[PDB]
Design an enzyme around this catalytic site. Structure first.
Site, PDB file in Angstrom:
ATOM      1  N   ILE A 181      40.588  44.801  44.309  1.00 50.94           N
ATOM      2  CA  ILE A 181      39.814  45.831  45.020  1.00 50.94           C
ATOM      3  C   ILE A 181      39.642  45.413  46.475  1.00 50.94           C
ATOM      4  O   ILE A 181      39.597  44.214  46.758  1.00 50.94           O
ATOM      5  CB  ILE A 181      38.423  46.170  44.384  1.00 50.94           C
ATOM      6  CG1 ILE A 181      37.536  44.911  44.194  1.00 50.94           C
ATOM      7  CG2 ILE A 181      38.545  46.989  43.091  1.00 50.94           C
ATOM      8  CD1 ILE A 181      36.025  45.092  44.637  1.00 50.94           C
ATOM      9  N   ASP A 228      28.737  38.560  36.612  1.00 48.71           N
ATOM     10  CA  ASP A 228      28.170  37.520  37.478  1.00 48.71           C
ATOM     11  C   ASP A 228      29.207  36.811  38.402  1.00 48.71           C
ATOM     12  O   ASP A 228      29.274  35.576  38.430  1.00 48.71           O
ATOM     13  CB  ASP A 228      27.347  36.498  36.652  1.00 48.71           C
ATOM     14  CG  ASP A 228      28.124  35.671  35.641  1.00 48.71           C
ATOM     15  OD1 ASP A 228      29.334  35.930  35.460  1.00 48.71           O
ATOM     16  OD2 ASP A 228      27.532  34.745  35.057  1.00 48.71           O
ATOM     17  N   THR A 229      29.979  37.582  39.189  1.00 47.02           N
ATOM     18  CA  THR A 229      30.924  36.977  40.140  1.00 47.02           C
ATOM     19  C   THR A 229      30.164  36.682  41.435  1.00 47.02           C
ATOM     20  O   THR A 229      29.154  37.332  41.707  1.00 47.02           O
ATOM     21  CB  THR A 229      32.196  37.834  40.363  1.00 47.02           C
ATOM     22  OG1 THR A 229      31.887  39.001  41.116  1.00 47.02           O
ATOM     23  CG2 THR A 229      32.902  38.213  39.063  1.00 47.02           C
ATOM     24  N   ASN A 249      43.741  44.203  38.785  1.00 41.33           N
ATOM     25  CA  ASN A 249      42.338  43.814  38.962  1.00 41.33           C
ATOM     26  C   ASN A 249      41.788  43.923  40.400  1.00 41.33           C
ATOM     27  O   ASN A 249      40.595  44.172  40.559  1.00 41.33           O
ATOM     28  CB  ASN A 249      42.151  42.380  38.429  1.00 41.33           C
ATOM     29  CG  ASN A 249      40.763  41.794  38.536  1.00 41.33           C
ATOM     30  OD1 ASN A 249      39.912  41.980  37.665  1.00 41.33           O
ATOM     31  ND2 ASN A 249      40.529  41.001  39.566  1.00 41.33           N
ATOM     32  N   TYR A 263      33.995  53.896  46.215  1.00 41.34           N
ATOM     33  CA  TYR A 263      34.360  53.005  45.126  1.00 41.34           C
ATOM     34  C   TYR A 263      34.478  53.798  43.825  1.00 41.34           C
ATOM     35  O   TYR A 263      35.422  53.601  43.077  1.00 41.34           O
ATOM     36  CB  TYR A 263      33.330  51.856  45.028  1.00 41.34           C
ATOM     37  CG  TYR A 263      33.535  50.943  43.841  1.00 41.34           C
ATOM     38  CD1 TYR A 263      34.370  49.831  43.927  1.00 41.34           C
ATOM     39  CD2 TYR A 263      32.922  51.205  42.618  1.00 41.34           C
ATOM     40  CE1 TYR A 263      34.583  49.000  42.827  1.00 41.34           C
ATOM     41  CE2 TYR A 263      33.116  50.375  41.518  1.00 41.34           C
ATOM     42  CZ  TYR A 263      33.959  49.285  41.621  1.00 41.34           C
ATOM     43  OH  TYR A 263      34.132  48.460  40.539  1.00 41.34           O
ATOM     44  N   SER A 264      33.535  54.704  43.573  1.00 43.61           N
ATOM     45  CA  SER A 264      33.526  55.548  42.381  1.00 43.61           C
ATOM     46  C   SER A 264      34.737  56.498  42.357  1.00 43.61           C
ATOM     47  O   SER A 264      35.336  56.686  41.297  1.00 43.61           O
ATOM     48  CB  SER A 264      32.212  56.320  42.290  1.00 43.61           C
ATOM     49  OG  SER A 264      32.138  57.132  41.128  1.00 43.61           O
TER      50      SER A 264
END
Ligand SMILES: NC(=O)c1ccc[n+]([C@@H]2O[C@H](COP(=O)([O-])OP(=O)(O)OC[C@H]3O[C@@H](n4cnc5c(N)ncnc54)[C@H](OP(=O)(O)O)[C@@H]3O)[C@@H](O)[C@H]2O)c1
Ligand SMILES: NC(=O)c1ccc[n+]([C@@H]2O[C@H](COP(=O)([O-])OP(=O)(O)OC[C@H]3O[C@@H](n4cnc5c(N)ncnc54)[C@H](OP(=O)(O)O)[C@@H]3O)[C@@H](O)[C@H]2O)c1
Ligand SMILES: O=C(C[C@]1(Cc2ccccc2)[C@H]2C[C@H]3C[C@@H]1C[C@@H](C2)[C@@H]3O)N1CC(O)C1
Ligand SMILES: O=C(C[C@]1(Cc2ccccc2)[C@H]2C[C@H]3C[C@@H]1C[C@@H](C2)[C@@H]3O)N1CC(O)C1
Lengths: 262, 280
Positions: free
Chosen positions: A96, A194-195, A94, A158-159
């Site tokens: 990043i 919604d983080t 998970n 990021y992509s």
């Protein structure tokens, strides 16, 4: 069809589980009676996560703090997490590197770091976990994005990283299929969640509808548990309707008959 | 006679039909041009009367491609030998190639690290190197060429693969990096579109090609039909000149018919209306 009892007593690794989707996944797994090992850099928020996990009814809860920039740490964490749980059933990738919306100009350091943390470390973590997952006929969960399927401006690095995940993990799924490796690969294509980090990074720019982190965490766990190839979770119902690539599945089926590993 | 001459080669119908004269006197960079598709592209460009600068590691092999280029009718032909593992070299090569041609109209990113068909086990060095040479060096080359391409309203050509659109076994690291190209370069195309940067991005999706490296790496492992390197080289150049977003080139006509993702173009169109970019 999913059952919460599918995760009862299961040995699970959750990366980037100090906050956001990662923390919610750890919380959901705790309620299901799963053994969990959470990781991130901060030795405070991982302590507060382990205690809330244990309060929700987790079978065993642990943390190992470190930076996923260090490939030696990533490799050592898996061996250590596996040591505390006596095996591994699910590997949830998970984490990043921190990202903000910006037009690409000359930030090669952010492109390299995005590849190292969002992709390279995932591969290192997979290599180190494969023997244990082979033993339990386990699952690998890869948390990606819509930016990992279609192109968007202001998130070029990021992509790239998210796209690599698709290319690397879908290729090894086809390898595990032929070499009869009973380890499933679950790639999760997510829209806006919604983080606290997302809401702060998107504010003023893209003001699209934001999906709840709680339900997002559950759908990722569901997908992995059922051993689904791909999970799609986004607020827009127009997304779900167009995101899938049936032409890709057909082409892959047509090219599988042209190879020989016999 | 060039000081009394003038005008534009791309008019009405230029948008839809290619002309070899579109590359006449154009300043082009061709990476991985010592053999294979890269060499064939350099050869095609020489016949068109284009100024060319070729690169790869082999000082000796690079020399030959240059000699044949000037014989083919190239406006000027040069080489700068170096490894694309070194980011400093990649950045310095563009500034030097641009110095030898007095500008740049087209940047052809073709090179890749040496790769073979193998199931993935523990070769992280090949995953890292595949990302550094097949992707990260393309990004450095782009940053260094952008000012010159902005000046000429130039083109960026990214040579990818079908394994950069769909999944195949035995090329996991290769496929990871060919996918990263799509993600990075399609994202910056949407950035150039809004920020009115007149630099086109041409991504080339290629199937099996009859290069010496490919034929040796695929024997006894994969039995698909291979397409000719000569025509492949031309279609890549064509797409760059026509400023096409994507070029598809393969032997199977069933590929061309299914490879396209129109649902992706629709979704991108739907998401563009949700963003605010009057900042950065
Ligand atoms: N949120 C969205 O709208 C959205 C949309 C699409 C995809 N996704 C995907 O969902 C996943 C989770 O996103 P999220 O928004 O829930 O995350 P988040 O709230 O930003 O949390 C990120 C986590 O990663 C950790 N982390 C950051 N840098 C790290 C490093 N160098 N090494 C190791 N861990 C590091 C953080 O903890 P420490 O700082 O303490 O290390 C934290 O636990 C990501 O893979 C993201 O791409 C999210
Ligand atoms: N052939 C196919 O079936 C096929 C299919 C799909 C896509 N493609 C793509 O088409 C492009 C060309 O492929 P090809 O088959 O024509 O290749 P090729 O014959 O193997 O040529 C590779 C070129 O890259 C150079 N190169 C290799 N490693 C390098 C490094 N470390 N630094 C700098 N230059 C380096 C080589 O010269 P030196 O070794 O002397 O440096 C040579 O000029 C690649 O992007 C490939 O992925 C080809
Ligand atoms: O991938 C994300 C959210 C983003 C990146 C983005 C990608 C595309 C569009 C806008 C932002 C990531 C990276 C970074 C900014 C955003 C919010 C967090 C996750 C983080 O702060 N999306 C929203 C799409 O529907 C899939
Ligand atoms: O991209 C290539 C060719 C390959 C990789 C591959 C990809 C898919 C299937 C087999 C091999 C690359 C990497 C390496 C092996 C192959 C030949 C060269 C280019 C190189 O030697 N294909 C063929 C598909 O139709 C798209």
């Amino acid at each position: 069809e999913f059952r919460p009892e599918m995760l009862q007593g299961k040995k699970v690794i959750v990366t980037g589980a100090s906050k956001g989707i990662g923390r919610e996944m750890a919380y959901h797994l705790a309620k299901m009676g799963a053994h969990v090992v959470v990781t991130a850099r901060s030795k405070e928020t991982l302590q507060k996560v382990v205690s809330h996990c244990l309060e929700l009814g987790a079978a065993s809860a642990h943390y190992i703090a470190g930076t996923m920039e260090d490939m030696t740490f990533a490799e050592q964490f898996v061996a250590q997490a596996g040591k505390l749980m006596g095996g591994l059933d699910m590997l949830i990738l998970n984490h990043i590197t921190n990202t903000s919306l910006n037009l690409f100009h000359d930030d090669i350091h952010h492109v390299r770091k995005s590849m190292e943390v969002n992709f390279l470390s995932y591969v290192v973590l997979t290599v180190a976990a494969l023997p244990m997952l082979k033993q339990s006929n386990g699952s690998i969960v890869v948390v990606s994005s819509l930016a990992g399927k279609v192109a968007y401006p202001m998130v070029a690095a990021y992509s790239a990283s998210k796209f690599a995940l698709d290319g690397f993990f879908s290729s090894i799924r086809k390898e595990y299929s032929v070499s009869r490796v009973n380890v499933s690969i679950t790639l999760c294509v997510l829209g806006l969640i919604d983080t606290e980090t997302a809401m702060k990074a998107v504010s003023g720019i893209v003001h699209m509808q934001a999906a709840p982190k709680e339900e997002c965490a559950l759908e990722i766990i569901k997908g992995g548990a059922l051993r689904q190839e791909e999970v799609y979770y986004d607020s827009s119902r127009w997304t779900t309707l167009l995101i899938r690539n049936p032409c890709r599945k057909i082409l892959e089926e047509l090219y599988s008959t042209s190879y020989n590993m016999d």
